[PDB]
Amino acid sequence: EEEQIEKDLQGLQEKQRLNVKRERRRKNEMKQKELQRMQMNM
RNA sequence: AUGCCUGAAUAGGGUGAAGCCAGAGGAAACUCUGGUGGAGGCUCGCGAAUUUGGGUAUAGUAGCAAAUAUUCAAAUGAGAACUUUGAA
């Protein structure tokens, strides 16, 4: 009964941590990509 | 040997390069995983070679001339294996 609460709490916390790391990486990558595109047309 | 002008042709199978997308590891650089993409001195059926047209430069013996399967009936004709029609 409580095992389900513990399991989905831990799973969704892990999902949020992975999402935070992935979003940081994606934001850095997209920022660098658009800066390179801006400086590439010359 | 090296060319020039105007045309035809430069096919197919396999593999899967940069670049890109979504993920995981790392502070970056980067490295793996899946996809996408469709590139090449990649493969498959000092030397040699490097498709093609037109134009234009520097004893009646050997044997039967070799491309397989012919058959039946009728017509023509002096004469039909070889011509013609039908059937196989």
Side-chain angles (χ1 to χ4, degrees):
Chain A
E1 293 177 350
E2 192 210 62
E3 298 285 328
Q4 293 179 356
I5 295 90
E6 304 288 337
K7 181 266 290 181
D8 61 4
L9 271 171
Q10 290 275 352
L12 188 153
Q13 267 178 306
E14 174 68 37
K15 288 173 183 208
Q16 181 155 1
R17 185 191 61 95
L18 294 174
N19 285 10
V20 175
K21 271 173 56 68
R22 182 194 74 241
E23 281 155 341
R24 173 173 75 235
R25 179 203 88 238
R26 286 179 51 76
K27 189 43 172 286
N28 174 253
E29 270 172 358
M30 183 278 288
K31 191 68 63 68
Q32 186 52 256
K33 281 190 300 177
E34 54 181 337
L35 186 148
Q36 205 199 3
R37 178 159 73 86
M38 182 179 72
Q39 297 181 3
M40 185 64 72
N41 303 104
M42 317 168 144

